[PDB]
Amino acid sequence: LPPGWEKAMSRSSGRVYYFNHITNASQWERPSEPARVRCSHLLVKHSQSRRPSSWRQEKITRTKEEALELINGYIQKIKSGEEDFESLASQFSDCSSAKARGDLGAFSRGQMAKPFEDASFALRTGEMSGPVFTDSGIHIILRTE
């Protein structure tokens, strides 16, 4: 199985699934290193972010755990096809990258916060992370190239 990926048992269903401890991705389907990758992300900041401020809201008051709830909801809507990643990022990301549908451009190792970087580099093109925690807040990351 590729980097980060492990088999787990579903506690609701009893079926095996796969989890990635690097990107916090999880899926039923069995899965599945570049010098640069290109990603977009959606950031939900909280009261404990390094700067609890954004273009959406001057003073970010939500708790870390309320932020995780928002992230989980967005992942649901992306996975169900109810909303697409780009649209939720444009509307709801606390990163200024929201204005470019969450697109950050290409980057190499040594540039991003390590949890983000490691998540980005362990995704394959087209793959989406689960909740990824950094000092900025909580991200969902989409590897586009």
Ligand X SMILES: Cc1[nH]c(-c2cccc(Cl)c2)nc1C(=O)O
Q: Which chain residues interact with ligand X by CB under 6 A?
A: 41, 43, 50-51, 95-96, 104, 112-113, 116, 134, 136
Least distance in Å: CB of 126 to ligand X? 19
Q: Please say which residue, 18 or 20, places its beta carbon nearer to ligand X.
A: 20
Locate breaks in the chain with C to N over 2.5 A; list the residue preceding each: 32
Q: Please say which residue, 5 or 116, places its beta carbon nearer to ligand X.
A: 116
Least distance in Å: CB of 77 to ligand X? 21
Least distance in Å: CB of 90 to ligand X? 14
Beta strands in 91-131 (DSSP E): 103-108
Residue 75 CB partners (closer than 8 Å, separation 6+): 128, 130, 131, 140
Q: Is 71 left (phi over 0), alpha (psi -120 to 50) or beta?
A: alpha
Pull the structure tokens for residue 84: 């697409």
Q: Please say which residue, 18 or 117, places its beta carbon nearer to ligand X.
A: 117
Q: Please say which residue, 100 or 113, places its beta carbon nearer to ligand X.
A: 113
